[PDB]
Design a protein around this nucleic acid. Structure first.
Lengths: 64, 128, 476, 72, 178, 56
RNA sequence: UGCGAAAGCAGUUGAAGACAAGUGCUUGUCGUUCGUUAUAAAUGGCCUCG
């Protein structure tokens, strides 16, 4: 997951997530949390969705 | 309840209806990097059979490693057997033994049966 | 997010004995006959050589005391249980008792006999009584208080007695082994001077040791046998040795994975370790320049670096040793809540591992073939790149100048069974990927000509191996 | 550590004991003094050298959502 | 009466801060402990303590959100490349057995300008186009650089540069209208 | 004697519509922002964010 | 694509519509349909907390 800083075109990264990112959102009055949907494309038989709520402060999984 | 996901095992507690763990049980490009483009054609090791002894303290896992395409050794699958053990208090299985190409080379382990409690106090298994 | 996985690149009993790495060879004037360890800290060990006895510091591994009063050759340096007192024998037959670390004063001197006194040992449970063995074939039992007559005079050996042992937990029992091949057990409680029973070794007895209260190991001739007194028969016997075994020592309850170890000298330059639990079976051995006459290991309670000492007839002494802002330090003992988040840094990664993590496929291959690179480690990086699916990618931007390092290793790796299959894959791609550059480069051409000769040689070996494999089936 | 009592109430058979936790926060407990022994010491769990556990981390600091890696 | 008499500190008192509304005093130092005392002037008992292993405290301060009065928070920093935030909202301060602590350690590409979080201050920024008001964490850089971060999310908002070595800074508010 | 009954849950629900992108997630965070509501294919789970457990 | 063992044994990869480009004709494409078991290439590589 890449946060592009548009002022300077920089970017912050959160790598090695559990699956490919289908959806991203900034969820809060002050952007406290990031809500992500992960896919886990390894399993071709089924689509394995996972909802991940990350704390924007330290990018730790607040709720998986 | 143990689900053999591809190259990983999902431990899921159906009483609470919550996942309790997700563990990688094989080598390979599993979370080292995100595969993109032709890297996405690679197949990680597949956990085919996963079984517990009657005592429940040992876990036997059978894996198939697929070679990359476009090589001379692109057709010689590698069959692996692994014996994992874990104390009840902790949640992470620790690998104790690893057997590469059991039964010979390129011969699958089609069946696995943990032994009954009578023989070796459930610390044996059969592979066929 | 998860931490990035790290790239994945004998017996425990052998691994313990492999820790005696540091080796020192000291030269003595004559054959070192006997070696003894002080039971007490610092556990200095004494070596008998020529006309002197030298005590070596455990930590310093150098001589700290020398007892040169002896006129003729010395035959023993055993300490007492307390370690204050050491006794020594002499060819003249005089037994001299000195205070340990005070060579000048001679606390007690006893004339055991006119013939040589080869063995002098302090009785383990009782400090006052000292045993002496002489070529007179009488193993007299002396007491420090009574220096004019022995307390008891054991007799009945028709040949030289050169081995005295005291059985733990049986202070009344005394064991003697003569060159008759007979090991005799005596009881001091009775009148004595006549064995309780005799054990036949069939070969001259060089050293008798009581490993445990009920088991005695007697090493004589080319074999050592363990005898149980309750059964009065040898339980087990080991004859792996070639020359005649000379000396034997036992240590128990030390920090090794093996609780107990039994070392036996060979007179062939071999001293090998035996564990009493596994039927006295071999686990380790060392080879020396010449025959070994004495072997010793530091006691169980060494309290520091362990020592292995071997004595050679040339006078060489071999030692192997197993070495053993005013508020910054508050640590929050009185506080309600302690919060810890510090995470130790991961173990330092090599150049090849860093390149793979950073997706530098070509540079990772280069780090594989560098001078002074382990062959096993070079195999992993090659296997990793194949597993990642990056073999052609690692070989795209290359020419003859940077292709030869890979081919050089392939020329050597093809011989190895482990790397034979890997070499085939990489060599297949480079030929399929650099066919045209091959024609216009002469140096590359010879790199294949020798490769074709070598790969042909492997084909002959594998065909040959199949043939021995075929006939081996016929035998079974 | 002993926590002093600054007030108490006793009605028929129950006794209400009051003490201060933190600085000035009053806490209360009701006990039946009739059944209490002659000398009785109430035991209370107060923060003292409490290791701080974050709900989003396990004992070793690995994030809960993260998957366990493979180690031989 | 002295504030630290009830529970003495094991180092110099590097920073002091009163709570904006409640009668509390916060202390910090190289002891690595955030001791909070209930200043009444006669007893001054200690409300709570939090030892931060390996995190010397050069400066600590309370923070109360200007819009959401229920939000209370403590920021502490030292000669380290990270900052700690301690949420005291609801019952976290006293009742909770555990402390809700977050570490700010990401500068979003501006690591070179910042060597240490030790010198920082907290202010209020009103996002005019939306009229929303939030807190900002101000830091001192290596070369005249002042790095400004979002107090809650920790995002890098903007940076200010002056010529010469930055020695100190302060914040002033100018009301415009209602 | 025997009887059949569903016990555990199923996959989380998504707005599986091809055109809509960025609005696939349907879960919502309470106004007090103390718990997250997630619809499943067979139930609706309310998780407390602070304790990371399914309160309801 | 079917079967099977992993080796292999058999069998497929058609038609229409629309758009673009070049010169009614040619080629290529399809977030278009019907039917059959049925190279890539926008300089673009994964965080910090010792």
């Amino acid at each position: 997951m890449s946060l592009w800083q548009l002022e300077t075109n920089s970017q912050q990264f959160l790598p090695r997530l559990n699956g490919i990112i289908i959806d991203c959102q900034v969820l809060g009055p002050q952007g406290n949390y990031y809500s992500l949907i992960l896919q886990m494309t390894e399993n071709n038989s089924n689509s394995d969705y996972q909802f991940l709520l990350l704390n924007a402060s330290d990018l730790t999984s607040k709720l998986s | 309840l143990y689900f053999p996901h591809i190259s990983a095992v999902q431990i899921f507690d159906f009483y609470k209806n919550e996942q309790v763990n997700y563990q990688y049980l094989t080598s390979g490009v599993n979370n080292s990097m995100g595969k993109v483009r032709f890297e996405l054609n690679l197949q990680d090791p597949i956990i085919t059979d996963l079984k517990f002894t009657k005592d429940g303290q040992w876990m036997i896992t059978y894996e198939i490693e697929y070679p990359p395409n476009d090589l001379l050794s692109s057709k010689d699958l590698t069959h692996i057997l692994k014996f994992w053990t874990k104390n009840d208090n902790e949640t992470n299985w620790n690998l104790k033994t690893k057997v590469i190409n059991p039964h010979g080379i390129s011969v699958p382990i089609t069946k696995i049966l943990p032994s009954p409690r009578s023989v070796n106090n459930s610390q044996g298994c059969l592979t066929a | 997010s998860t931490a990035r996985p790290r790239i994945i690149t004998t017996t425990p009993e052998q691994r313990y004995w492999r820790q005696y790495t540091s080796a020192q060879l000291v030269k003595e004037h004559n054959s070192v006959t006997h070696i003894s360890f002080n039971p007490q800290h610092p556990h200095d060990f004494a070596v008998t050589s020529s006309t002197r006895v030298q005590i070596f510091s455990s930590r310093t591994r150098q001589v700290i005391k020398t007892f040169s009063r002896f006129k003729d050759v010395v035959y023993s340096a055993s300490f007492r249980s307390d370690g204050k007192l050491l006794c020594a024998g002499d060819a003249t037959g005089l037994v001299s008792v000195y205070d340990s670390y005070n060579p000048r004063t001679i606390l007690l001197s006893i004339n055991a006999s006119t013939h040589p006194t080869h063995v002098t040992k302090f009785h383990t449970q009782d400090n006052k009584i000292l045993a002496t063995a002489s070529d007179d074939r009488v193993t007299r039992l002396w007491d420090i208080s009574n220096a004019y007559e022995p307390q008891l005079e054991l007799t009945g050996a028709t040949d030289y007695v050169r081995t005295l042992s005291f059985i733990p937990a049986a202070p009344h029992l005394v064991a003697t082994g003569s060159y008759d091949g007979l090991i005799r057990l005596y009881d001091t409680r009775s009148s004595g001077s006549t064995p309780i029973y005799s054990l036949n070794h069939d070969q001259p007895v060089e050293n008798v040791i009581a490993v445990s209260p009920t088991q005695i190991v007697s090493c004589g001739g080319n074999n050592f046998k363990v005898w149980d007194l309750t059964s009065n028969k040898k339980l087990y016997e080991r004859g792996n040795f070639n020359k005649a075994v000379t000396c034997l020592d036992y240590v128990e309850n030390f920090d090794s994975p093996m609780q107990s170890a039994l070392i036996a000298s060979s007179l062939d330059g071999h001293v090998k370790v035996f564990d009493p639990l596994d039927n006295f079976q071999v686990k380790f051995g060392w080879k020396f320049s010449g025959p070994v006459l004495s072997c010793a290991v530091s006691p169980s309670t060494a309290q520091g670096n362990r020592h292995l000492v071997a004595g050679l007839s040339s006078g060489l002494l071999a030692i192997r040793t197993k070495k053993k802002m005013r508020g910054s330090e508050y640590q929050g003992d009185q506080e309600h809540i302690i919060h810890n988040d510090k995470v130790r840094s991961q173990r330092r990664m090599r150049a090849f591992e860093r390149n793979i993590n950073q997706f530098k496929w070509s540079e990772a291959l280069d780090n594989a073939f560098v001078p002074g690179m382990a062959k096993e480690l070079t195999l992993t990086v090659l296997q990793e790149l194949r597993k990642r699916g990056k073999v052609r990618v690692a070989l795209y931007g290359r020419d003859e100048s940077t292709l030869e390092p890979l081919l050089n290793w392939c020329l050597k790796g093809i011989e190895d069974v482990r790397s034979a299959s890997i070499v085939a894959d990489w060599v297949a791609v480079v030929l399929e990927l650099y066919g045209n550059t091959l024609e216009s480069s002469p140096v590359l051409q010879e790199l294949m000509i020798d490769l074709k000769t070598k790969v042909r040689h492997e084909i002959h070996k594998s065909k040959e191996a199949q043939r021995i494999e075929g006939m081996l089936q016929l035998l079974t | 550590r002993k926590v002093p009592i600054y007030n108490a109430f006793i009605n028929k058979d129950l006794l209400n004991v009051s003490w201060l936790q933190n600085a000035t926060m009053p806490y209360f407990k009701n006990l039946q003094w009739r059944e209490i022994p002659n000398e009785y010491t109430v035991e209370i769990s107060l923060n003292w050298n409490n290791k701080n556990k974050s709900a989003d981390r396990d004992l070793h600091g690995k994030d809960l959502a993260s998957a366990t890696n493979y180690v031989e | 009466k002295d504030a630290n008499a009830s529970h003495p500190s094991h180092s110099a008192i590097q920073s002091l801060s009163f709570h904006p509304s409640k009668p509390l005093l916060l202390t910090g130092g190289y002891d690595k402990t955030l001791r909070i005392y209930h200043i009444d002037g006669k007893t001054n008992h200690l409300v709570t303590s939090l030892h931060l292993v390996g995190s010397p405290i050069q400066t600590c301060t309370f923070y109360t959100s200007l819009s959401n009065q229920n939000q209370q928070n403590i920021f502490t920093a030292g000669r380290r490349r990270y900052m700690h935030s301690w949420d005291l909202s609801l019952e976290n301060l006293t009742h909770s057995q555990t402390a809700k602590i977050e570490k700010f350690s990401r500068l979003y590409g501006h690591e070179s300008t910042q060597r240490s979080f030790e010198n920082f201050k907290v202010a209020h920024l009103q996002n005019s186009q939306t009229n929303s008001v939030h807190g900002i964490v101000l830091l001192q850089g290596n070369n005249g650089w002042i790095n400004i971060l979002h107090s809650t999310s920790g995002l890098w908002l903007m940076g200010c540069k002056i010529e010469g070595v930055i020695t100190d800074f302060c914040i002033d508010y100018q009301p415009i209208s209602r | 004697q025997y009887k059949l009954s569903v016990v555990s849950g199923g996959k989380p629900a998504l707005n599986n519509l091809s055109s809509v992108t960025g609005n696939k997630n349907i879960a919502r965070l309470s106004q007090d922002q103390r718990n997250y509501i997630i619809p499943f294919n067979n139930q609706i789970k309310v998780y407390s964010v602070e304790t990371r457990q399914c309160v309801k």
